[PDB]
Amino acid sequence: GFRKMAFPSGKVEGCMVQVTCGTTTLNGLWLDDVVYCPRHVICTSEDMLNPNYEDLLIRKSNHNFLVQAGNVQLRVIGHSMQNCVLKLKVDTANPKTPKYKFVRIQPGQTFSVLACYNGSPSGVYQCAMRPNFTIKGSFLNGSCGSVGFNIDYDCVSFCYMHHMELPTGVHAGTDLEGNFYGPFVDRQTAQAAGTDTTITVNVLAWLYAAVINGDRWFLNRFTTTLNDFNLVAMKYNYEPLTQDHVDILGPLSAQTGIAVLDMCASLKELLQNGMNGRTILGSALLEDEFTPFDVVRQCS
Amino acid sequence: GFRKMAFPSGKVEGCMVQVTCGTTTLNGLWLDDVVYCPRHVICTSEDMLNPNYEDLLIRKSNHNFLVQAGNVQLRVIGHSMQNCVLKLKVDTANPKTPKYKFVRIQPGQTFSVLACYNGSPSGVYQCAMRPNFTIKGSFLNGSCGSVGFNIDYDCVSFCYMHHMELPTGVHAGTDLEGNFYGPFVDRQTAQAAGTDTTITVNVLAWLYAAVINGDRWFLNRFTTTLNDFNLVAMKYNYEPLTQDHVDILGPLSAQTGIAVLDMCASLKELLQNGMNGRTILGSALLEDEFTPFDVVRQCS
Ligand SMILES: *C(=N)[C@H](C[C@@H]1CCNC1=O)NC(=O)[C@H](CC(C)C)NC(=O)c1ccc(-c2ccc(OC)cc2)cc1F
Ligand SMILES: *C(=N)[C@H](C[C@@H]1CCNC1=O)NC(=O)[C@H](CC(C)C)NC(=O)c1ccc(-c2ccc(OC)cc2)cc1F
């Protein structure tokens, strides 16, 4: 079978804390003696329309920030604002700090999200950074500060912090340095993301996973060229395929014996003729939230 | 938004161990001073066709079972066979045993699976016990012994241990007492599950979640009766709806203002007229892997 898998969230659960400022409570990430949380924790419902985060932060001191690590309070001995993230220096280093790094991911890359509320883990799911720098997640009120991460061996790769929801229902956020993904800003205004396109290289990797798992009806026999396929990809709002993407799908194409351009022609036929009621790996649509890495990781 | 969420797997990761017997290695569950693992760990490739698990277990002693807790070995001071599970008594109680209980779940109930290989967690995903007592999971070789669980507050509810894969690609396993879900046996023979039906009450809960999340095109205006709806449900291989299922969907029907029989008629229209290319919560099919509990948990 083939399923959407999230990373084990054990190493991240021990880093989630509750951060309270005034009458706003959200989640923070406790790594070493630093707590990271969205800076709009210092905002009231009034200021959220057009906040001057400077002027707002100047009127706050260390003792205005309440940090909850379960039942134990952490003492805040320093605060600073880096882009759209607030960094609270605490006197106690997190005894369960895992080996970690901060990374800024690229569009199309996937990661696991640990949805939290009041510093408590609630669930985990697998997400993908859309080409328009949004994510299609599941977030309620108070979910801000929840983190997205990847796990390589022992190391945790923090890549996302949830900040806001857009009018279309999708979600926007920053890296762990406070830099937003995309052209979004942290204020209550109608912000528009671009037209969301489909991650073509991810769809191809998913079609390869279908081949490995016995689902092989969609495999036509035509072939195509990179330029000819991309001409059709533009018409269906698909991301253009590059020779880099072709080489990335190399191992999958070598395992299944199906050339990348052969799979491109089969996708072409699926885009112009549709599913006709037939599912692929149990889905009646084309899934683009599996990277080529995710496919080989799950299939091996 | 609305996503398939798994429980945080932190409390379960600390219970996974590696169990080796001869040249067979699978995962075991280390709770207190007991290790639970599938009994076919004592099988060779020859015996798996028609094993006499008794005769096979009689020829094994305590020191034939190798238990790996990461890098540390656990000393086996007792072994016993309970149904299709093997219970290894070790001298050291797991210092990270969470508050836990063993439960046997019902068809249609959901749970999180922590896929493991060689006693190491690899990923987590959300599963559902199909009405034919199989699961549509993602399992490779060596994944046996991986556990399914639910998390209420602090307590972990272990409900599934993976054992085998069926010819159709679905998976079968036992509860933590070794009793298989369904009519399956642990030997390499072509075993057939019944015709898999759709969990009707779960589809209704998902349609309610779509209503809460603004997706409301499918809502017709007709109504129906429980007997009339069930007449159509049988024709599409849907599970029959009972008055118990109606009362379970009560809170969801009270939150959305849509009567259960009204939603039943809208599902009826979807079954006979199809999607017509329109998605619901981003899916072109009817998802039945969300219980009414899962919906209210995620929507609140
Ligand atoms: C974090 N706790 C919270 C998560 C949100 C809440 C609901 N679902 C989520 O994911 N994030 C916030 O409250 C944000 C605070 C700002 C200051 C960063 N704001 C928003 O999520 C937000 C922004 C904008 C809108 C919106 C929608 C439509 C529209 O049309 C006129 C105009 C503005 C909504 C919204 F929830
Ligand atoms: C556990 N390590 C492993 C997991 C399997 C392996 C592949 N994917 C999984 O989920 N489980 C086993 O190896 C089982 C051991 C038995 C003794 C409990 N066996 C199976 O999973 C198994 C059983 C039967 C078949 C099969 C399929 C088709 C068929 O048509 C004639 C006949 C038998 C396959 C199979 F993998």
Nearest to A81 by CA among A57, A47, A114, A105: A57
Place of tokens 């590696």: B18
Nearest to B141 by CA among A153, A299, A295: A299
A27 Cβ closer than 6 Å to some ligand 1 atom: no
Place of tokens 């590059």: A242
Nearest to B224 by CA among B256, B182, B270, B164: B270
The residues pairing with A244 across neighbouring beta strands, listed in sequence order, are: none
Of A20, A143, A165, A174, the residue with max ligand 1 atoms within 8 A of its CB, to mutate for a pocket test, comes to A165
Helix (H) and strand (E) counts in chain B: 8, 13
B8 contacts in chain A (CB < 8 Å):
9-10, 13, 114, 121-124
B293 contacts in chain A (CB < 8 Å):
none
Q: In the structure encoding, which two tokens stand for residue A256, read together?
A: 């299944």
Q: In the structure encoding, which two tokens stand for residue B192, read together?
A: 């057939």
A14 contacts in chain B (CB < 8 Å):
10
3-state secondary structure of A41: helix
State how far the Cα of A159 lies from the Cα of B83, in Å rounded to an integer: 46
Q: Which residue type, as a one-letter code, is found at position A15? A: C
Q: Which residue type, as a one-letter code, is found at position B84? A: C
CA of B15 to the centre of ligand 2 (A): 25
Q: Does B194 touch chain A (CB under 8 A)?
A: no
Resolution of the experimental structure, in angstroms: 2.2
State how far the Cα of B150 lies from the Cα of A46, in Å rounded to an integer: 40
CA of A217 to the centre of ligand 2 (A): 24
Q: Do A4 and B9 touch (CB under 8 A)?
A: no
The count of other CB atoms within 10 Å of the CB of residue B46 is 8
Torsion sign over Cα A155, B24, A215, A255 = positive
State how far the Cα of A61 lies from the Cα of B138, in Å rounded to an integer: 50
Q: Does A2 touch chain B (CB under 8 A)?
A: yes
- Name the residue ranges covered by the structural domains of chain B: 1-13+99-196, 14-98, 197-300
Q: CB within 8 A of A213, min separation 6: which ones?
A: A1, A2, A281, A299, B169
Q: Does B221 touch chain A (CB under 8 A)?
A: no
Nearest to B9 by CA among B124, B109, B99, B147: B124
- Provide the CA B76 distance to its chain's centre, in angstroms: 29
The CATH architecture assigned to A197-300 reads: Orthogonal Bundle (1.10)
The count of residues in chain B is: 300
B141 Cβ closer than 6 Å to some ligand 2 atom: yes
What number does CATH give the domain A14-98? 2.40.10.10
Superfamily (CATH) of domain A1-13+99-196: Trypsin-like serine proteases (2.40.10.10)
- Provide the CA B300 distance to its chain's centre, in angstroms: 23
CA of B44 to the centre of ligand 2 (A): 13
DSSP string covering A56-83: HHHT--GGGEEEEETTEEEPEEEEEEET
B141: exposed, middle or buried (C-beta count within 10 Å: 0-12, 13-18, 19+)? exposed
Q: Do A283 and B279 touch (CB under 8 A)?
A: no
3-state secondary structure of A197: coil
The H or E element spanning position B272 is helix B260-273
Name the closest-CA residue to atom 27, ligand 1.
A167
Q: Does A3 touch chain B (CB under 8 A)?
A: yes
State how far the Cα of B259 lies from the Cα of B176, in Å rounded to an integer: 39
Strand residue runs (E) in A39-185: 65-69, 72-74, 76-82, 85-90, 100-102, 110-117, 120-128, 147-152, 155-165, 171-174
B169 contacts in chain A (CB < 8 Å):
1, 213-214
Nearest to B8 by CA among A80, A272, A15, A232: A15
Q: Does A203 touch chain B (CB under 8 A)?
A: no
The H or E element spanning position A37 is strand A34-38
Could you tell me whether strands A155-165 and A147-152 are parallel, antiparallel, or unpaired per DSSP bridges? antiparallel
User: Are domains B1-13+99-196 and B197-300 of this chain identical in fold?
Assistant: no
- Asked if B114 and B149 touch (Cβ cutoff 8 Å), the reply is yes
State how far the Cα of B116 lies from the Cα of A196, in Å rounded to an integer: 35
Q: In the structure encoding, which two tokens stand for residue A68, read together?
A: 């909850």
Place of tokens 């094993």: B51
Q: CB within 8 A of B77, min separation 6: which ones?
A: B62, B89, B90, B91
